[PDB]
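Hello,

I think I submitted the Opicapone job twice by accident. Can you confirm which output corresponds to this input? Input:
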Amino acid sequence: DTKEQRILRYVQQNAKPGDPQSVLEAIDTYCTQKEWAMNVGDAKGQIMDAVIREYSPSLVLELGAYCGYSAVRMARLLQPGARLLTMEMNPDYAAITQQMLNFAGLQDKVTILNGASQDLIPQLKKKYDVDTLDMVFLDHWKDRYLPDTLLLEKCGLLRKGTVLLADNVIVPGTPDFLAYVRGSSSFECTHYSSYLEYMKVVDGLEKAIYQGP
Ligand SMILES: Cc1c(Cl)c(C)[n+]([O-])c(Cl)c1-c1noc(-c2cc(O)c(O)c([N+](=O)[O-])c2)n1
Ligand SMILES: Nc1ncnc2c1ncn2[C@@H]1O[C@H](CSCC[C@H](N)C(=O)O)[C@@H](O)[C@H]1O
Ligand SMILES: [Mg+2]
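Support: Only one job matched these inputs. Its output is below.
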């Protein structure tokens, strides 16, 4: 089997069904003690939790689901009626994410989009009944952060106050995205310095709040 299947099996065998917090702790436990994996982790996840609780977004878009750790982390804090849409181009990973969300009891809150973000972003308004996004979590391939941010703006998916939260802006790093949002008056930026998941390597999240054209 794969590492992603072993993570899901550990959750199914150790986490409590319908308990998102228990599912998160099981994923973090397995990857801390057995196999490292690119989940956002508990250190940066706690910063994510605080950002989510401050802005209380009604519609969240996630770029990169992997095994569903970040989707479980964000969906467990959403108000009733709020929605999370997550895009995952790997079908093997998205099948794991769906089973992870089902186990945590959050399937009614999260919708998985199978495909590449650059192909799915232009179809959000028509196919998934989206006006503008309240929050965007960027966590896919690092070279897509900036072009997808420009694509989200072109398709009219950003409004004044839309919160962009970017992972891995230090390690592995997103230099072009970081330089663009920090240099553009369209984005007010705040850096939250933390640590790479399950490690003591320095990383951080960048919050970029859209201010308009
Ligand atoms: C593990 C590691 C170590 Cl020990 C060192 C020293 N360095 O330099 C790097 Cl770069 C890595 C590293 N490899 O992959 C990732 C990573 C993390 C994500 O959170 C993420 O989302 C994605 N991703 O591909 O989406 C990738 N990090
Ligand atoms: N262009 C793209 N469109 C959609 N998904 C992409 C993508 N490029 C990479 N990805 C996916 O994004 C994932 C990044 S790992 C992200 C982990 C997750 N956000 C968490 O914290 O738990 C990978 O699984 C990869 O398959
Ligand atoms: Mg990441």
